[PDB]
Amino acid sequence: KILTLTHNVAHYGWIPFVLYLGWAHTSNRPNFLNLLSPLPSV
Amino acid sequence: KILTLTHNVAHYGWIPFVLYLGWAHTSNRPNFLNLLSPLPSV
Amino acid sequence: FKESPLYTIALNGAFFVAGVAFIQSPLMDMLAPQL
Amino acid sequence: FKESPLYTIALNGAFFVAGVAFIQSPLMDMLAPQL
Amino acid sequence: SFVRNAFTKSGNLAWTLTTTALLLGVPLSLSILAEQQLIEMEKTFDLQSD
Amino acid sequence: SFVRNAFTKSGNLAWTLTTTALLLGVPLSLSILAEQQLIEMEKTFDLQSD
Amino acid sequence: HSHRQSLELVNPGTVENLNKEVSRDVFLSQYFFTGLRADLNKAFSMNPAFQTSHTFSIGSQALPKYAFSALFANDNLFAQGNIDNDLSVSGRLNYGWDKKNISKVNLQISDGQPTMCQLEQDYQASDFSVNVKTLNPSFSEKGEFTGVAVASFLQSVTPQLALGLETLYSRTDGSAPGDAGVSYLTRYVSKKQDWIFSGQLQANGALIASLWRKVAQNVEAGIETTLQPTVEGSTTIGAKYEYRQSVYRGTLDSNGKVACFLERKVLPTLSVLFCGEIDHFKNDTKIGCGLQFETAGNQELLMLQQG
Amino acid sequence: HSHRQSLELVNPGTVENLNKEVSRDVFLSQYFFTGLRADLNKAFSMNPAFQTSHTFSIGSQALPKYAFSALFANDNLFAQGNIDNDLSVSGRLNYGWDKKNISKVNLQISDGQPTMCQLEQDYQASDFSVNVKTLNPSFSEKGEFTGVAVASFLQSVTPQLALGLETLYSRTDGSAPGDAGVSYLTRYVSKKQDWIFSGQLQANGALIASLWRKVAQNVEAGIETTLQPTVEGSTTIGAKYEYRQSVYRGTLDSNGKVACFLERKVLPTLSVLFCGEIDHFKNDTKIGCGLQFETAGNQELLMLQQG
Amino acid sequence: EKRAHQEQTEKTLKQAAYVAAFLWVSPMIWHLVKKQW
Amino acid sequence: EKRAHQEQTEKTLKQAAYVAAFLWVSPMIWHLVKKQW
């Protein structure tokens, strides 16, 4: 089901590409829990 | 009929007697306009 | 006595031009606080 | 499995007892700010 | 009569105008008060620095 | 499946508890910080006078 | 009557003040509202109390559009008159024959509905409290009472606990014989006055139990129990954060609703107040805002208000 | 080509920014809402502009229960992604081939409706700016266009006045011949930039005339009027009171409704906000309050935020 | 028919009065209990 | 029937093109008008 496999990528995979974009350019590069956490606990 | 005569006048005039009591006790005794005015213009 | 769409458009335009005159007048500047 | 008026009354009583135990405990006392 | 109609008209217009004026002004009152409070404390800080 | 049910339940309860916490806390936080600021200013005036 | 004094019983609080600090000082139900409201009250005298008030509200069922109220209170007598838009007139008069014995009358005219008025007569003793309330008294042509009457008793069994009762009689028309209702009242106070419990049992079968603790001078917390075949119950808990500059109130409910009510005294003359709540079991909210100008009438009281 | 440069004109703004001041900057339609709203936006870096936002809101139909968004903006490329509960994916990309020529596309997944997307190629010259936008094109089997097209031109004839036009062709299906939408633009600028006027005539018979002013460095106001046989028109006056600590906006409407919005910053990261509109032709109100947390991503920006 | 309900209410009110008398007496019997303690 | 509508759309588009040409030509015209005055 490659056709719908590409379909699921558009929804779930768009934001993490942006997230991966920022995390790549972050000088800190924390872990996924810290990225998704709205807390400033760093 | 006397209670009916009381019905109309007492309904309107209860507060006027209340303020007539207060206006007597006032050290200033300002005018009716100042009594009815919420403005502190004194 | 008209009470027409022309009446309502005319009153809207009159209100607009009155507001324009008000905003141009220095009375608004007086309304504007000095600070 | 009851799903009964006695069930909900027992739940309410449990809430009452939990609350009174909590308040009598030093838990809110340490929750209470020093200031 | 016409007196009661005029009284009701005056009361309604007074109520609506008062409500609009207060809800326009109280936020202005508090905001300008806070800003001028900041201004005066900043002036006092300048004076104590100098 | 059960994973989706658990995720939806967790998200709903998390959102509910978060909104309750913020609503119960923000007025308290602003009030207590305001009063603490007032304590600070009054104690600064006290030490300046003394 | 000698050992009566030798047991040094204390004066119990009034029945209406049984759960006063819980239902009123702790919780917010009477204080809470919805929509935009404004309070404009001004005062002219203090030694004989005398002040008026303007109230502007919108977006609330209970609060009218605009109402004016004036109250007067001398050393022993209290008077209060209120007028509302649609010409609704209500008034309360307190006239105490003595400190212990007080006479009260409540008047309220709807002008389109039967005028409801209640008469309250209470006497306070050194060890027990009593009071009688009647609603719309009327005697039938046979000389028989028709209306609603309320009488309550409360006695200090010990300086720590006070148990009392209330008796109510209601004859709507006289054709139907009046019914009697007896409710049990119970109150206990901590030996050090730190925590207070209050429990009652209504004649209707409803049970209301309330409790409180004075955790500190700036914090209170209270928990109440209310329940009512057809048996329904509720549970609400909450705390109050009172302070010199502002006071907050907020509660938690078994019905899945939360509450917030904070009045923000920004000026010695001006107090803003904010309130809101959530209904999680219904996913709906209610929000309201308010402010209060209190202003003196004369220059001297204005100066005292400003400092 | 030489005397054209000798005219010494300037580049006007875009049509979307034609009414920027009076519509977006001064008034509150973009910023107003109803009910409670909580916002959690935070930036991990500044020079590469990157931040993510959390949005909690209840009581407003337009705003969802919770939505999450993120955005990035480098020197020449801007990106923004947004997600909502029910999984409505939202994303927008803005890339600039040059400071004058910018390519940008908007995406919005509905997940239950046909996804809509818009693409915009924006180029500006020294004296004019051109935009071309489309919404869901489609090519028929004949090679003919089917969709909605948006394109406008705007040129400053004199350094104080600019005139523009927009062409809109919508081909819904191809069975019915497409329609054309032509609108006229007019913008005037004060020589001292004290006041700005803008007026447009739409293809739908709707004329929007707007006047803006800058009273001083901190005070500004504006007036606008719209109109639409069946012809209806409205007028709104308003003013924005900007300050270092708080921001106020006020609004009076010809349709008998009033509104006020107040952003009050209390902390460098805490920003409480209030808004409420009150109608009088039917005597009802709408109230909304909220706040915004802004936090840094790293210790350096965390320290910088405090100073 | 309603007469029986009327005297039932009378019984309730007299029981309430008796309970009032008992609670008035109660401080003294509590004092006696404390003496017993 | 629809042919008339299509021709109306065509002439509207041609009018838009003429307006664009006129507006691009306009600045020199206004400059020379100012020079005359």
d(CA A40, CA H303): 12
d(CA F15, CA E49): 49
Contacting residues for H97 by C-beta, under 8 A, at least 6 apart: H76, H103
d(CA H11, CA H124): 7
- The amino acid sitting at J5 is H
d(CA G253, CA G235): 6
Do you know the residue count of chain B?
42
> In terms of C-beta density within 10 A (0-12 exposed, 13-18 middle, 19 or more buried), how is residue G212 classed?
buried
Number of Cβ pairs closer than 8 Å across G and I? Answer: 46
Q: Domain ranges for chain J, please list them.
A: 1-37
- Chain I window 1-37: which residues touch G at a Cβ cutoff of 8 Å? 2, 5-6, 9, 12-13, 15-16, 19-20, 23-24, 26-28, 30-31
Contact B15 G48 (CB under 8 A): no
The 10 Å CB-count burial string (b at 16+, else e) for H202-231 is beeeebbbbbbbbbeeebbbbbbbbbeeee
Residues of F with CB below 8 A from H66's CB?
A: 15
Picking from G58, G66, G291, the nearest residue to E26 by CB comes out as: G291
Q: Which residues pair with A41 in a beta bridge?
A: none
H helical segments located in J1-37: 2-36
Structure tokens at G257: 């609703």
> In terms of C-beta density within 10 A (0-12 exposed, 13-18 middle, 19 or more buried), how is residue G207 classed?
middle
**Given CB atoms, is C33 within the 8 Å cutoff of chain E?**
yes
| C-alpha distances in Å from residue I1, one per residue of D35, E37, H203, I6 | 67, 78, 84, 9
Contact E30 G58 (CB under 8 A): no
- SS3 assignment, position E24: helix
CA dihedral angle for residue H58, residue H61, residue H63, residue H65, rounded to 10 degrees: 40
Contact H36 G285 (CB under 8 A): yes
Contact H298 A40 (CB under 8 A): no
What is the phi/psi pair of residue G227, to 5°?
-155, 160
What Rg value do the Cα atoms of chain B yield, rounded? 14
- SS3 assignment, position F43: helix
Q: How many domains are contained in chain G?
A: 1
Picking from J16, J24, J28, the nearest residue to H182 by CB comes out as: J16
DSSP symbols for G168-219 = EEEESSSSSPPEEEEEEEEEEE-TTSSEEEEEEE-TTS-EEEEEEEEEETTE
d(CA H25, CA H30): 9
d(CA D17, CA C13): 70
Among E13, E18, E35, most H C-beta atoms within 10 A, so best to mutate, is: E35
Contacting residues for H49 by C-beta, under 8 A, at least 6 apart: H43, H71, H72, H73, H74, H78
**Given CB atoms, is C26 within the 8 Å cutoff of chain H?**
no
| C-alpha distances in Å from residue H33, one per residue of G174, G277, G304, H261 | 57, 18, 42, 10
CA dihedral angle for residue G198, residue G200, residue G206, residue G212, rounded to 10 degrees: 0
Neighbours of H81 (CB within 10 A): 23
Picking from F27, F32, F34, the nearest residue to G260 by CB comes out as: F27
d(CA B34, CA B40): 9
| C-alpha distances in Å from residue I2, one per residue of G172, G175, G177, H121 | 15, 11, 8, 90
| C-alpha distances in Å from residue G240, one per residue of D8, G175, H57 | 28, 49, 26
Helix (H) or strand (E) holding A20: helix A14-25
| C-alpha distances in Å from residue G248, one per residue of F27, F39, G240, G263, H278 | 8, 18, 6, 7, 27
What Rg value do the Cα atoms of chain G yield, rounded? 22
d(CA G243, CA G252): 21
Contact G213 D23 (CB under 8 A): yes
Contact: chain B with chain G (3+ CB pairs below 8 Å): yes
Judge whether H39 and H54 are in contact, CB under 8 Å.
Answer: yes
What is the phi/psi pair of residue C9, to 5°?
-65, -40
